[PDB]
Every structure is written in C-alpha cells, then in structure tokens.
Ligand binder design. Sequence first.
Ligand SMILES: CNC[C@H](O)c1ccc(O)c(O)c1
Lengths: 252, 128, 52, 340, 231, 224
Amino acid sequence: ALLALAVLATVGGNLLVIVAIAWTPRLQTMTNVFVTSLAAADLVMGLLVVPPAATLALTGHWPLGATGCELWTSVDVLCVTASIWTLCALAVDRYLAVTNPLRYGALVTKRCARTAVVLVWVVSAAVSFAPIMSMPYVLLSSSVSFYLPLLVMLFVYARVFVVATRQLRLLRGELGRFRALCTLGLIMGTFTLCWLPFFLANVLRALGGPSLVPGPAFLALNWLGYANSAFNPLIYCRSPDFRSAFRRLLCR
Amino acid sequence: QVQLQESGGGLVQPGGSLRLSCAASGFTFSNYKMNWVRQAPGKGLEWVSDISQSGASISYTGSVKGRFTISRDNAKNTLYLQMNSLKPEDTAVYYCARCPAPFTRDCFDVTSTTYAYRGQGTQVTVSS
Amino acid sequence: AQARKLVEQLKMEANIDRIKVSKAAADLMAYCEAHAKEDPLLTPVPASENPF
Amino acid sequence: QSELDQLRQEAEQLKNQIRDARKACADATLSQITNNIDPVGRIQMRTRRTLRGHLAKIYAMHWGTDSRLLVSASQDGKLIIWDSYTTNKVHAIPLRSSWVMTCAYAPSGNYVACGGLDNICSIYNLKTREGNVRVSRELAGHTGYLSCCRFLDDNQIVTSSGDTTCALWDIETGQQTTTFTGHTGDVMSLSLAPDTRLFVSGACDASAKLWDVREGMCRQTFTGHESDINAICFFPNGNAFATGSDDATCRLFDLRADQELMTYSHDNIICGITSVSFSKSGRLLLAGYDDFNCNVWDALKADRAGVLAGHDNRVSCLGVTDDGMAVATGSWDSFLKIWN
Amino acid sequence: VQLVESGGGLVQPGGSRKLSCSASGFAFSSFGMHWVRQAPEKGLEWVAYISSGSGTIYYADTVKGRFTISRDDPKNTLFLQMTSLRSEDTAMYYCVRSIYYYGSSPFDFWGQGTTLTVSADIVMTQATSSVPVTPGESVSISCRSSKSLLHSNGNTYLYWFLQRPGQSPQLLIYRMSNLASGVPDRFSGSGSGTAFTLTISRLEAEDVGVYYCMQHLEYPLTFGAGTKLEL
Amino acid sequence: LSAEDKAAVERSKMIEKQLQKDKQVYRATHRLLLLGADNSGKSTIGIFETKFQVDKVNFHMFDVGGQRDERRKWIQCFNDVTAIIFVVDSSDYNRLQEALNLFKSIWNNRWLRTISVILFLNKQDLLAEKVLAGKSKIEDYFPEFARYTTPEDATPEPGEDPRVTRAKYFIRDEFLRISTASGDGRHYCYPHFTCAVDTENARRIFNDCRDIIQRMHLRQYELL
Ligand SMILES: CNC[C@H](O)c1ccc(O)c(O)c1
C-alpha cells in the first residue's frame, strides 16, 4: 500500500541526496554538512523504524521481543530527535548566512560544522537512551526534542523573513524608478504540520490522563510525523546544483 | 578579411545635409552591432551612434540628437548615417566601426586609438 | 611610415611560391592515413596498456 | 594626403593581387578530395582522472614531455605540478601576482614559466639543491599582459603579449633577442613548429601570422576569421595549423597553399572557442568552447565526432600528450579532467 | 647544503645519549631524514627514519624500543634519543636527507657523522669483496638481492653509494639506472630483478673506495657488504 | 604501493593541507576592481594594489594601469570579484558620454553580467563650482536635461543650490537608467557622491559589499 511507497520514497530520496553530496565536489559546502546529517537520520528512519511499525500494525505485536521493543523505541526517538535538531541547525546556519554575510565564512567553519553534527547526534542518543542507561520523562524529552528547536527556528526565521522582505521592498523601489514567503512558509509549515500534533498529543498523555486522546489517534499522529522524512529531500535539495547532480547520477 | 569602406563625405555649408555609407564585407553583417565614430581635428575619437543587429535599438550622442539618423541594410551589407542641419563643430573624419564580437549588446574598444574592426574614414568639412 | 611598412610587407608576401590546394589536401590525407596506426585517441586503447 | 593615398592604393593593388594568386591555386577543396574516405565514426571519451586542489578558475595548463607530469595555473596565484597517473601533487608554487594568464613546461622538465597582467614572464627552477622551487629569471620588456609563452630549450623562450608583439628571449641574460612586430591587436596565442624553426600566432585582429625565429620576419599572413583569434595549434607534420576565434568557428590553414582549407562550424554553435589541439595523428581536432563543452571534430571531413562534457564552467585550456595517449581540459570550475 | 652531527661520546656499557644533527642551506622541513650507522668493522646499516612532517616514523629491529627519532623544524635539527645502550651500538651515525616525489633523488646528501663508542628482510649480497684495478681501465661490480626489486611500477629500487676513505658515502645511482646530479657520466647502472651491475668505464683517481648497494622496496632498508675497490 | 610511493602520497597530503590553509584566507578576502579614467581621480580613492581592513574584514582593490586602451580581453580576468568600483569625473561634461558608454559595456558584458558596480561620482566640488559659474551648460551635451526635474526622493545637503542638486541627480540618474535597463536583478548599482577630501569611502565600500553578499545569499536560498 502507501506504506511501501513511503518506505521506498524515503530510502531512495535520502540515499540519493547523500550520494550526490558525497560524489560531487560542487555540492560539498558547509550548509550541506547539516543536510548530510538530516539525510542520514531520515534514511535510518526509513530503514529501521517505519517497516517495524508496519509489521507491528499488521501483526499486532513486534516479533523481535523484549529487547527488540526497547531497541525500536530508542532508535525511533534518536532518529526523530536528530532530524529535528538538524532542522534547527540548518535554520541557524541560514540565519548566520543572511544576517552576517561578511563574517559567515569565519563563523561557520568545517570543524564547527562537524562538532555541531556530532553534538546533535550525541544529544539525541542521550535523550533516547536515558531510560535504559539510568510522565516527567515524556514532558522533558518532548520539550528538549521538539519545543526548544521549534522556538529557535521560529525566532531565526522571523528575523530572516524581516530581512528578506525589507530587501525585496528596497529592490522593488530601486527598479521602479524608471519569494521569501513561499520558501519560509513551506519550510516551517511542513515541519509544524508533521510533528506538532504528535508532540501536542504526547504532552497531553503525560500532563493529564492519556484517555484524553485514544490509542489509534496517537499512532496515526506518529505516522503523520514519519512522513516528514520523505518530504525533507524535496524541501532542502531543490537547488539547481542538486538537480543537476541528480540528473547526472540517475542517467549514469 | 574584414573590410569597411566609408564613402559620402565632402564639403558642405552650415545647415546643409550629407549622407554617409559604409559598405561591409568579410563577415556576417546581420550578426553584429554597428557604430559610427568620428575624430575632430586635435581631438580624440568620439562615439556618435550605434545600431543593433536588427536595427530595433538605436542610440545617439547628445551633440547629434535630432540631427543625425543611422540605419542599416542587412541585405546590402551596408550602413548609413544621414546628417542634417550640419554645423562647423561636425567637421571631422567619420569612421564606421563594428563591435568586436557577434550576438552581444556590449561594444568594447570601438573608440580606441588602433581598433582593427574600423574603417579608414571619410572627411566631412562644414564651412562657409 | 606605417603605410610604407605595410606596403613593403605586402610586397614580401606576394612573392610566395604557392602550391596547389589539391596537393596540400592529398599530403594531409596521406599523413593522416599513414599515422592513424599510432593514435590512441583514434582507436580506443584496451585497458591492458592504458595508463589511465 | 596624396602620399598616403598612393600608399593605400599600392596596398589595395597588392591585396587584390595576393587574393587573385590564392584563387589561382584552389583547384579543388579539402572536403572535395576527402569525400571518398570512411568516416572516423563516433568517438566517446570518458573522464579518467579529475585533478582537484586549485582554489579558483584554472587559466592555463601544459603537458610535460614525458606525458605524465603537467603544470596548471589558476586565479588563486598558485602553480601546481601534477602526476596525472597517481593524481599526486608534485609541487605547489606560490606566485607574486594572482593574475597569471599562461603557463609552460620546459621540454627538459627543469623549468616552468608563467605570466599575466604583470607584463613579466617568470621562470622557475624545479631542480634546485635546496629542495624548493625558486624563481630563476623575470623577463621584463613587454608593455602589455603576457598571453602565451613556450620554451624552445632551457635558454630560449618565445612570448606573446598584449602590445601586439612577440619576443624571443635569452633567459641567461634576460634580454630580448628578437622582436616580432606586425600584428594590430593583442596577440592571444602562439604555437611552435615541430622543428621549432617557425611559429604561428593569433591576435585580436582576425588574422594569424607565420614567423621565422632566426630571421625574425613575418613570412605569411592568414586572414579568414571574422573576430579575435583565441587559440592556434600546428598540425603534427608542421605543414598546417588550426585556429579558434570568437566568431564561433574553427579554421584550418595550409602553409604551402597560403589559404584556408576547411571551416569547422554549425549554425547551432554560437559560442566562442577558447582552445584547440590535435590528436597525435592529426585526424581529430579538439576545441573547447564557452558553453562549458569541448567538441571533437573530424579534421579531414569537418564532421563532429563527439563531445567532452562534464565541466561546470567555461573551458579555458586544452592539451594532448606528446604520445597522444590522453587529453587534459581545464575549466573555470577549478578542476582538471583527463579524457580517454 | 650542510649536515652537521653532534652529541657523540663514550658511555657506559648501558646508558642514555642524545644525538643531534643541525641542518643548514636547504629546506629542512621538506626533506625526510634517516639515521645510518657504520660499525668500525662493518658496513652501513640503516637505523631510523622520520618522514617530512613527522607523520611516519620507522625503526630498525635492533633499535626498536630503545631509540627515538624526532625533528624540530623551527630550529632545523634532527634528534636521536638513545636509551639502554648496548655494546653493539659503537658506530658512526650519519643523518641523511631524502626527498620523495616523482622523479626525486632520495639519499642525495649525507652528513659528516658523529662517532659514538660504548664502554622477512631482503638480503643484499655483494660478492668479490676486493677488486684490484688500474687507472684508465674498465671495472664492473655486481650486487644481488634475495627478492626481486622490480615493483611492476617500472621502477627498480636499487641504489648505489660510494664511500671514499675518510669521507662520507655519496649517492651515485638511484633507482638502478639514473645518474645522481654531480656524478661523472663514466658511471653506469644496469641490471634486472635480483641481479644488478655497476659499470665504471675508464676509472680515474678518487674512484677508490667501498661501493654499497641499497634497496628501497620495503622500508627495513638493507645495504650490501661493500666491494672495497682497491689499487 | 612501494615505500617511495607512500612517501610521495604523504607529501601530496601535506601540500593539500597547505592548500586548505590558503583556501581559508582566500575565501576570507574580498577583491575589488577599480575602474575609471585619467581625470576620474580614482588614484585618490603596473597594477596599483591596496589593502584595507574596515571592521576586521579584508578588502583587496586592484587598479590595472599598465595596459593599452583596449580592454575587451584582460577584463575577463575579473569575473569573480565582489564588486567593481567605477569612478567618473562628474564635472567633465565632455567626457561624460564616454564614461556612460564604458559603464554600459561593463554592465552588459557576458562575463561581467553578475558583478555589482559601486559608482563613485568624484569631483562634486568642481561640479558645484562649474554649475554655479554658469559658463558651461549641461543641455549642450545632454539635451534631455531641459525636461529633467529633481527626484522626490532626493536628499540635498542643507544650503546647497537647487541647480547643483538638479545637475548632481541628473548625472546620477544617467547611470541609473543604464543600470535599471537590464540584468533582471542579478546585480545592482550603488551610486555615491564623493569628494577629494572624503574620508568615509572605505565605510561606503564596506556597506555596499555587505549588501551585495547579503543579496547574493538571499537569492541563492530562494528568498529573493
Ligand atoms: C514511538 N514513537 C516515538 C516518537 O517518535 C517520539 C520521538 C521523540 C520523542 O522525544 C518521543 O518522546 C517520542
């Protein structure tokens, strides 16, 4: 059904993005360091997370066992946290590129990018493995995985939107002497629509009886959250160089 | 090779009229933007007018606006410059100059001291 | 005397003992056919002796 | 100006006599006598190597005589010697001026040369006892940018320049021995004959000239192009040469016929040529264009035999090894590619 | 170009000692350095090597764990920290410069050397350890290796060195055919895998000495016994 | 791989490390091309290179002045500079059309179509002296000046004669007309009125380069 379509779409798109960045020196920029992390997180979701969920939905029980359930849940949490924090890092990188054009090269260097990616993955690993390594947990994990990145992205992209609109109006005034909204709206709306309902319902499960939202609705929200991995290559790899690399790789 | 031959220059009285012709050969005439350049005695070369490849875009210098008319015949591979209401300040050697490259809107070095794609020139003298 | 120098050069260039175009074309074709054997770009070279 | 009228008259007479003399020699065409030979077929070359490391556009490159080492010049002010077989970097030479426009490799492999907007041709010694690469001589005297330089031996180098002149230099004394004057525009390229007794040059006047090195006089002039000539390359046997211009055309000229033999162009090709070269048999003519691509031409039939696609920006230089084993292409995307 | 060694002295049967080689006249940072010893009753023996930039460090089996080789590029100095010295370490130690790129000439220059006195490897065989000659004649010497030195790259990593009496050894032939810069054309190198020959046509004065063949195929570099050209 | 091959590889890696160190400083530096004429006065503002470091950002301006009068070939070397600084003599009406033609050729060149131009109108004091003198007339060289009116967005200095303001802004709009006629936004013109005793030109260049690179980043991120 649409399950296999989503799995193939996610795996193929993210693997293609990773390969295109790896084999094309032109695409090996500082921003694409974070795109590589996002694609890796989305690929690992599409390979080791979604098909287990489909098997559990079809059979009504995970076949792996007691260790399998724990491993699946931890891998799901780690991948989701890594994906959201990588989105936040991409937003911050765009913010620094726009608001500090002259000093951008010194601010965001190679070592800084690798350190940020490693820190993102380490924080997600800690968040996912805290219950096994050592209501409050749900709130704290959801706040550190979704809400703080959401606030940071909102602030960053409001600044970027203000700058872009001001520059567009200035250019329009200049050319009349004789699209930021679409891009930013797509970027923020896809992420918010995909993951906001799930974390809203999650916080509800902890603060207040879970009954407030039944079981099937919760799993359907989680599946709505899973769709964000398939859409990310479309959102973050529409540059003409990306399309050219895709055309070269598929045709060869 | 590239050849530009200018003709039609002579002696006229102030307020008179003249017509200059520039016959081109050795290149695809319709592919290039064409210019008229003059050099007054004891002065450097000065751009006068230009005509685009199709003749749709025309530019004139301020000193000649309203008195000079430039046109091209792509079939005949020739360029014209009709000059009316001439004044003694127009006494100079008029050169028919071609842009260095085809299919370009930019025209570099047509007024240089030694430009290859420029004619020998025709003398126009306005005097009473 | 730039015109005098140009005229002198043109006089020098008008003394060239020219050959027929057909002979030149035949000589070019003969060289191309004779040396076609040693031309890696003409015949793709097998990978055994290809340094690249 | 009666005297100047007389001189222009004699020149028109001599130019119509030369034109008539050339016309009385065109019994047939090159395409007329090569119509009965088999087509070269389809040539499909693949990128065998990619040389990375230059930080900006590559402006020039020259193959070594051993067909393994090559030198490249870039906007970053660096000269790099490459090992094409292993992709290793042998040397990295910093340059005083980042506006280099040409580079050359001595046939003995002991020296490399470069020059550009500084109007100076710098000679670098590759084999010093100190283990580094040191500038050995700075040839000054040109008033205009250096556009091309080629070694004759370890002590003789021929340069072309933006002052419409070419020069023969004595490297030991740093002084010009012969000056070649006669061009009207900037001389953009030069090509030595196989015997190094003559060389051709293309200038920004839609004309090419043949020079004698020992006599230091122009021998013949070839005027078929319509815009500035950017590249020139001698036929392998030294009896012909090919030129590339901004008219978006390639042309072949014969020395003993004193006229053009063939034109390599198509109505859909509207981009200028930056570099030309021949395969070691002379059957294939390779030309780089402004549209990021290189075309392989059947030199005897004027048919396009293939393309060299894969560069992301303008192709700036082109070269074929002395053994005809590979082609190297430089581009404004800061990469070099080896094709086979 | 000069290489100067200092630090030698008389040590107890066992102890520590540091050897320093100061370099001047060339780009010390671009060259790889070697330590070569020579026992008073033996030939040359490779000791240790440090790459340019100190990225690769190799030691001989006899000194592994006891010797440390290091370089300080700021001051153009090479160091050999020797600990737990044994009775077999009495020799003269040379610092040898070696640059490595396509067409380079490794082992081109040898230092003067400092004398120190204590109180799966290729065997390089050099037969006929004594050869009498007469000036104005042609002589030929041969060196054999346990394993073929051809690498399928087309290169044969066989090197020839001449050591004059009282002087340091000097490079003659590198990679079995190429004449080192500053060597008379009378010298010639030829041979095949596991069989090499050095030909001296019309030998003159100052050609007397001990000729050593060295391999550069796998890094435990081994020398020959020496030919000891005589009169 | 023999030992010498490994050593050659290691040397190549060292060269690559040095190349990366050079790449950092190359990317951190902004290159500017200085263009003008003999009387433009760009020297106050045979390659005459200069370096300045306004606000810790490094700028490197070049002035090619050892070539012939033909520039269609060597000008292609500067297709990757951050900006072109064009200096004109605003008081010289005779040479104004030559400057306008050069600006048009630079703007519409195939290889210079993406370079933003910082326009400096240099001799404003001489322009004011000539306008107030009344001897020379702009309408002699530019007939359309008679139908020109001062722009509503003009910001004249207090105490400045309206005639001087009109001449100044007409000369500026002459170049702005060329700048806004093509290029569809890939590049922009930043006009500035200058003087021989101006000490704020470095700050103006810094601000213009900042705006250029910010607009480039906005364009490449599909934010216009
Ligand atoms: C089983 N579904 C887990 C969901 O992906 C999830 C992601 C991140 C979290 O912090 C979390 O508490 C739950």
